[PDB]
């Protein structure tokens, strides 16, 4: 058992705070909701608090808390994300949009009191101002994904390479190549996993009564096994 397991046995409130800068377009996003790791379930509503989001909401889904994944009993020794809690972990990514710009993200995921917080800094560079991303040409939807989590023994953490495919309105695909690394915050012991898969599914919706630019997200993440 990890020192973080017991912190996720019930419904946990979540706060997400993102400070963004893409090609010099500054923006901020605030998210609120709750996670129920027993069912691998999270529900979040995100608001662009600076006005219109200058990138498409789907491109921010992976950036905007894998500690809410459901690890089956025979897999709980591989749950790095909960084991780091409450002190937490750093999650860093570069996201390469094919034939367009790239995001660099650095996030701290940790408890502040009873609330699980995901505090993010995002920098976007080399985007095309009239391209598919800054031109808002991506559909408001998301595909299910399987991600291979690999141990990073040198960093006492994990790493992952995976592909997200966003739908472009012309019927083609915008590829987003993700490189990810996670490391414990501080001098904290963690469970170092063996390689395994997470299976994700995400549904994007809108609050019909909400006038601000926003995204409602329902996400399920399950550790599928060592294989598949």
């Amino acid at each position: 058992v990890s020192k973080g397991e017991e912190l996720f046995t019930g419904v946990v409130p979540i706060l997400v705070e993102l400070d963004g800068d893409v090609n010099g377009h500054k923006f901020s996003v605030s998210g609120e909701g709750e996670g129920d790791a027993t069912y691998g379930k999270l529900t979040l509503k995100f608001i662009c608090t600076t006005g219109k989001l200058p990138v498409p909401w789907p491109t921010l889904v992976t950036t905007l808390v894998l500690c809410f994944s459901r690890y089956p009993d025979h897999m709980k020794q591989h749950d790095f994300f909960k084991s780091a809690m409450p002190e937490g972990y750093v999650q860093e990514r570069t996201i390469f949009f094919k034939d367009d710009g790239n995001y660099k993200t650095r996030a701290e995921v940790k408890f502040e009191g009873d609330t699980l917080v995901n505090r993010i800094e995002l920098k976007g560079i080399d985007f095309k101002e009239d391209g598919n991303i800054l031109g808002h040409k991506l559909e408001y939807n998301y595909n299910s994904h399987n991600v291979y989590i690999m141990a990073d023994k040198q960093k006492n953490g994990i790493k992952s390479n995976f592909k997200i495919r966003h739908n472009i309105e012309d019927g083609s695909v915008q590829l987003a190549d993700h490189y990810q690394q996670n490391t414990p915050i501080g001098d904290g012991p963690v469970l170092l996993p063996d390689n395994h898969y997470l299976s994700t599914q995400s549904k994007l919706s809108k609050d019909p009564n909400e006038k601000r630019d926003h995204m409602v997200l329902l996400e399920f993440v399950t550790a599928a096994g060592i294989t598949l």
Side-chain angles (χ1 to χ4, degrees), residues 2-103 105-109 111-129 131-136 138-152 156-202 204-210 212-228:
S2 85
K3 53 181 80 184
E5 286 171 357
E6 99 281 20
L7 305 170
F8 291 90
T9 55
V11 175
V12 173
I14 304 171
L15 300 172
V16 181
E17 295 290 335
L18 179 144
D19 184 84
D21 167 5
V22 177
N23 273 24
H25 305 267
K26 304 314 175 68
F27 62 100
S28 301
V29 174
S30 291
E32 296 179 24
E34 64 191 31
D36 200 351
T38 300
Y39 309 102
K41 180 182 183 173
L42 65 88
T43 313
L44 291 167
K45 178 182 178 188
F46 301 101
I47 298 166
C48 180
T49 63
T50 43
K52 189 269 284 182
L53 194 70
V55 298
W57 282 109
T59 71
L60 298 185
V61 167
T62 50
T63 298
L64 294 165
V65 283
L66 293 171
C67 49
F68 289 102
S69 308
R70 176 174 80 82
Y71 276 74
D73 179 76
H74 70 285
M75 299 279 304
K76 288 184 186 295
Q77 69 270 30
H78 300 297
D79 191 348
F80 164 91
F81 306 105
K82 291 187 192 56
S83 85
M85 296 300 166
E87 319 77 68
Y89 57 79
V90 179
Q91 183 160 290
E92 292 167 297
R93 293 208 187 94
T94 304
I95 302 170
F96 298 90
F97 295 90
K98 183 69 175 172
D99 286 333
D100 212 327
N102 60 89
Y103 297 159
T105 70
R106 187 201 177 270
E108 293 183 15
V109 187
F111 276 90
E112 297 286 359
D114 301 318
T115 301
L116 192 281
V117 170
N118 178 20
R119 192 183 313 160
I120 313 141
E121 166 206 306
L122 178 150
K123 288 304 199 295
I125 83 166
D126 289 332
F127 283 89
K128 294 164 181 182
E129 289 286 333
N132 288 330
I133 288 111
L134 287 185
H136 293 282
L138 305 188
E139 302 186 332
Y140 189 73
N141 48 35
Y142 218 77
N143 302 311
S144 305
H145 193 232
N146 291 320
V147 292
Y148 201 52
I149 302 297
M150 306 186 67
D152 192 349
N156 207 31
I158 57 104
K159 78 198 192 198
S160 187
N161 303 312
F162 58 91
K163 292 172 183 293
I164 300 295
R165 280 169 288 276
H166 301 292
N167 276 7
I168 309 168
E169 297 182 330
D170 70 355
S172 62
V173 152
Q174 172 69 66
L175 173 59
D177 282 297
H178 283 57
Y179 164 69
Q180 178 182 332
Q181 56 180 36
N182 297 60
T183 56
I185 288 172
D187 289 310
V190 295
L191 292 168
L192 190 54
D194 286 281
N195 305 343
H196 63 279
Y197 283 101
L198 306 176
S199 291
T200 68
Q201 60 190 90
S202 305
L204 314 190
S205 58
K206 302 287 199 181
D207 181 343
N209 304 111
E210 177 59 69
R212 298 166 289 179
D213 201 2
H214 72 281
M215 169 169 70
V216 179
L217 171 69
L218 169 66
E219 185 180 283
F220 296 93
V221 182
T222 308
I226 303 289
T227 63
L228 300 209

